[PDB]
């Protein structure tokens, strides 16, 4: 068909015996593709004592293209809940922590921080401290053991905290009246919260955070980043698949 | 009194796609409304209602001189990881998956002087031979001819024809399911200008719109970066 | 016969906010009635239907002499942890949380001699500049003027205007979401008395009532004491 | 609040035939239609509507000369692992199981010259004696006589008669349940030809159709290969 292009809007051609659908597009559905615990991030827990580095659940950064990174940066604004599932890969001899309680405490956008000691468990001597803000209360704590536990993991819901009617991925402006190099693409708390992990462990194991993004709503499309170099002109790119040849 | 149950052997395991959520640790969190327009539910949706420039040579367009004729103008192995279809939205979307079942459309936006005419030919070569290399060989296949001058661009729908209900979003060594063929455009009439002086060459943009029957099935993690 | 089940990996873990109780180890405990009045279900409720003195300097009131004029009378960065709004009910309530979305009200109870008149001006300065420091600078913003003499106090509603649907119940380094601005009151007319002798200064109480659209969302544990 | 349950001792065990599936880790996978004809739901089905050549000597047929008479022509212990019924569809199907309850049918496709006639006799010998070895002994049992010439083949239904409702799909040392007897065919009239010269022998195919009341019950793994 004769196209009078230039005015944005694409242009189709439609052959004969057009082909019937099947699959129904379905597998390309935004909310659907994003409702699955991904393995994103991975950190080191805290010793009960001393001061913590409040971890922040901001999954709008990307880079290692594990097909979840690109997908989040295909939209401009994003609004979804969250759900996590911490696990904890032992790093040495998995029989050196005969208990390991881990005070996974989640915090909502805006919750204070400064967490020094204030708790202490008294029993026959010794007494082991717990992080002040770590204890239980307002913001949901989960205590799971790292011994004999046939899955040194947990997991829960975390409804959308942030103040913004929707989460802006890439911001063009700044985050604070201190037009500073950093606050560019920052914007005050374009995120899902934090988490403080404290356990008698901290060493002898890591974690593997995870996100389940139920009710993912995406707005304002954006271009989708290639993720693979360019090949040799005229031809195909050849990745070893299920199929392949031999 | 106490119910009787039996754990499956699997039991206390992970499952990275359990159809069912987790325990709601924070509740009653009412959420504020959203007034932003340009929202989407489906990804196919955006690549259907939107083209993207295919990368020929390093640019999104071929040339047309008054010294061509026989030679092919544009060629590429119709598979979602073939050179040209590398940078496109439609092709870059694909790699979150494993399969596609769609005929594609291309639009040829001719950009030469308004005193230029080029006339022309496109052709789809189903897989068999080893790339016809002259229209006289290619015209015996499915092709379309077009005359710039008053049009100001054109559209060609590279259909879907193959024995498999879904093909591969990933290219690999010659399979009956990788390659759907080639896409070719030819100089059915070497370009012309007011003066060969002022107007040397004409160009043409190669934009890729997702076809009207096209869809991606099966999400898949990303391999290595290669 | 036996049902088939599968434990989630999480399983035998704590959960400090599981929407669902525990096992009822004592039962049938009927409980006696309660006849005490002044009961409550909601906390916002009490801070709306009740003011609280803001702590200016160490006291809950500013002065008004017949030697003022230009100078600011009262100023504070409208954020629920700014000095003045530190001791108030409404502000102290807040810290069990993380967010607020409300415009506040203040009431100016003038306490000077009954032979004193002071006339006056209040002003709300949205965030931008660096604190106007003369009414001539401040009057170009939203302000109200009031004349004690027969009134016997006054009320000013510092609204809510900002791009975010909820702000921070905790102050911090300058953010677009911390600061909502300043609240200012001015000497639009230096105080007057029967005799400058008997009546030196007049005063005025600064009481803070929660606004009519104000609410706190998100409970949060308390950090450290600082 | 929390439900009360009790795991059976068994609990966290396997179970290689649990009436109930597993956890659906991939979902919504719509599947394409199938247009292939010649489909089946039941296996008995195919062996009923289909014969298979029984392997006598190494071939699927016996001979008929004009020098026979008394001698038996074909004999085999009617049990689904007896020599002849070894290569047949119906018998090879069987070994995925343990039991059968059916009378079988056989068809005798005579292949001798079109100038040949053979006339003849079949006989079913229920289990008792030790194999009659002359028709004069066998004809006193259930038998059928047939005359090739215009027929062009024949059919004999070896019924099911025994005290057990199901028998063994596996043969073994003489049991009341293994052996159902023998199947025998005889030369009730030694073959004849235009010339004993041109036509020496006539032959006959022994095809095995599953009976009309035949069925296999009980699937069973395969033992060793012997």
């Amino acid at each position: 068909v004769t196209n009078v292009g230039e005015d944005g809007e694409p242009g189709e051609t439609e052959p004969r015996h057009a082909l019937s659908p099947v699959d129904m597009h379905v597998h390309t559905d935004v909310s659907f593709l994003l409702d699955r615990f991904f393995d994103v991030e991975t950190l080191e827990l805290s010793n009960l004592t001393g001061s913590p580095a409040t971890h922040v659940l901001d999954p709008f950064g990307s880079t290692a293209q594990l097909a979840w990174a690109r997908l989040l940066n295909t939209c401009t604004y994003f609004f979804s809940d969250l759900e996590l599932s911490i696990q904890f890969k032992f790093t040495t001899t998995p029989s050196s922590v005969g208990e390991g309680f881990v005070w996974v405490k989640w915090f909502p956008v805006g919750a204070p921080t400064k967490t020094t000691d204030a708790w202490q468990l008294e029993g026959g001597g010794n007494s082991v401290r717990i992080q002040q803000l770590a204890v239980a209360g307002m913001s949901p704590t989960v205590v799971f053991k790292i011994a004999g536990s046939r899955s040194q993991a947990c997991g829960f819901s975390v409804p959308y905290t942030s103040m913004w009617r929707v989460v802006p991925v890439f911001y063009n402006g700044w985050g604070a009246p201190t037009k500073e190099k950093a606050t560019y693409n920052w914007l005050p708390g374009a995120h899902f919260g934090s988490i403080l992990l404290t356990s008698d462990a901290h060493d002898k194991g890591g974690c593997y955070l995870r996100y389940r993004f139920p009710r993912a709503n995406m707005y304002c499309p954006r271009p989708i980043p290639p993720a693979f170099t360019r090949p040799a002109d005229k031809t195909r790119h050849k990745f070893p698949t299920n199929i392949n040849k031999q | 009194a106490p119910i009787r149950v039996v754990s499956v052997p699997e039991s206390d395991s992970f499952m990275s796609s359990v159809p069912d959520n987790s325990t709601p640790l924070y509740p009653k969190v009412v959420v504020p409304p959203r007034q932003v327009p340009g929202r989407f539910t489906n990804f196919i949706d955006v690549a259907k209602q939107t083209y993207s420039f295919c990368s020929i040579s390093g640019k999104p367009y071929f040339e047309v001189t008054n010294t061509s004729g026989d030679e092919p103008l544009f060629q590429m192995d119709v598979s979602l990881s073939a050179a040209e279809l590398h940078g496109t939205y439609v092709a870059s979307l694909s790699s979150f998956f494993a399969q596609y079942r769609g005929s594609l459309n291309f639009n040829f936006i001719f950009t030469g002087a308004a005193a230029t005419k080029a006339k022309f030919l496109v052709a789809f070569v189903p897989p068999h031979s080893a790339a016809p290399k002259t229209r006289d060989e290619a015209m015996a296949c499915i092709h379309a001819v077009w005359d710039v001058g008053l049009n100001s661009a054109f559209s060609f729908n590279v259909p879907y024809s193959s024995p498999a209900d879904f093909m591969a979003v990933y290219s690999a060594e010659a399979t009956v399911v990788n390659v759907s063929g080639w896409l070719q455009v030819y100089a059915l009439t070497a370009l012309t200008s007011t003066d060969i002086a002022v107007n040397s060459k004409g160009r043409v943009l190669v934009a890729v719109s997702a076809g009207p029957d096209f869809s991606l099935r099966h999400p898949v993690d990303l391999p290595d970066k290669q | 016969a036996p049902i088939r089940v599968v434990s989630v990996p999480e399983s035998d873990s704590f959960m400090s906010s599981v929407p669902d109780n525990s096992t009822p180890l004592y039962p049938k405990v009927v409980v006696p009635p309660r006849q005490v009045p002044g009961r409550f279900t909601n906390f916002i409720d009490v801070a709306k239907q009740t003011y609280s003195f803001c702590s200016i300097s160490g006291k809950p009131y500013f002065e008004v002499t017949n030697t003022s004029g230009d100078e600011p009378l009262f100023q504070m960065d409208v954020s629920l942890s700014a000095a003045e709004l530190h001791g108030t009910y409404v502000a102290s309530l807040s810290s069990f949380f993380a967010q607020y979305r409300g415009s506040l009200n203040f009431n100016f109870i003038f306490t000077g001699a009954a032979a004193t008149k002071a006339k006056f001006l209040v002003a709300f300065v949205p965030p931008h500049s660096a604190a106007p420091k003369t009414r001539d600078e401040a009057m170009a913003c939203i302000h109200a003027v009031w004349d004690v003499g027969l009134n016997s106090a006054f009320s000013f509603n510092v609204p809510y205007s900002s791009p975010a649907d909820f702000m921070a119940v905790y102050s911090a380094e300058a953010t677009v979401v911390n600061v909502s601005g300043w609240l200012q009151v001015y000497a639009l007319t230096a105080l007057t008395s029967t005799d400058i002798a008997v009546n030196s200064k007049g005063r005025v109480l600064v009481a803070v009532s929660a606004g009519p659209d104000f609410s706190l969302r998100h409970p949060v544990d308390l950090p450290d004491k600082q | 609040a929390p439900i009360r349950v009790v795991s059976v001792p068994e609990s966290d065990s396997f179970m290689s035939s649990v009436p109930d599936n597993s956890t659906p880790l991939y979902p919504k996978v719509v599947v394409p239609p199938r247009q292939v004809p010649g489909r089946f739901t039941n296996f008995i089905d195919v062996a009923k509507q289909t014969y298979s050549f029984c392997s006598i000597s190494g071939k699927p047929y016996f001979e008929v000369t004009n020098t026979s008479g008394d001698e038996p022509l074909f004999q085999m212990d009617v049990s689904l692992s007896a020599a002849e019924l070894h290569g047949t569809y119906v018998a090879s199907l069987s070994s995925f199981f343990a039991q059968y309850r059916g009378s079988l049918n056989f068809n005798f496709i005579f292949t001798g010259a079109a100038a040949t006639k053979a006339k003849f006799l079949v006989a079913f010998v229920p289990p008792h004696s030790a194999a009659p070895k002359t028709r004069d002994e066998a004809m006193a049992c259930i038998h059928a006589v047939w005359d090739v010439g215009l027929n062009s083949a024949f059919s004999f239904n070896v019924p099911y008669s025994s005290p057990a409702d199901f028998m063994a799909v596996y043969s073994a040392e003489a049991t009341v349940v293994n052996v159902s007897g023998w199947l025998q065919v005889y030369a009730l009239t030694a073959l004849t030809s235009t010339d004993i010269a041109v036509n020496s022998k006539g032959r006959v195919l022994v095809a095995v159709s599953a009976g009309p009341d035949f069925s296999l019950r009980h699937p069973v793994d395969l033992p060793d290969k012997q």
Binding site: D29, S31, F32, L34, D35, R36, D81, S157, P159, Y160, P214, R215, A216 | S17, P19, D20, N21, T23, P24, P27, K28, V29, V30, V31, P32, P33, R34 | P19, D20 | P24, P27
Partner: peptide
């Protein structure tokens, strides 16, 4: 989205997720 089990509403949708308006 990927929650097609008839136990998802053990926790009613208030505790489960959020709400808009």
């Amino acid at each position: 989205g990927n929650s097609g089990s008839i136990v998802q509403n053990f926790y009613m949708q208030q505790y489960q997720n959020s709400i808009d308006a």
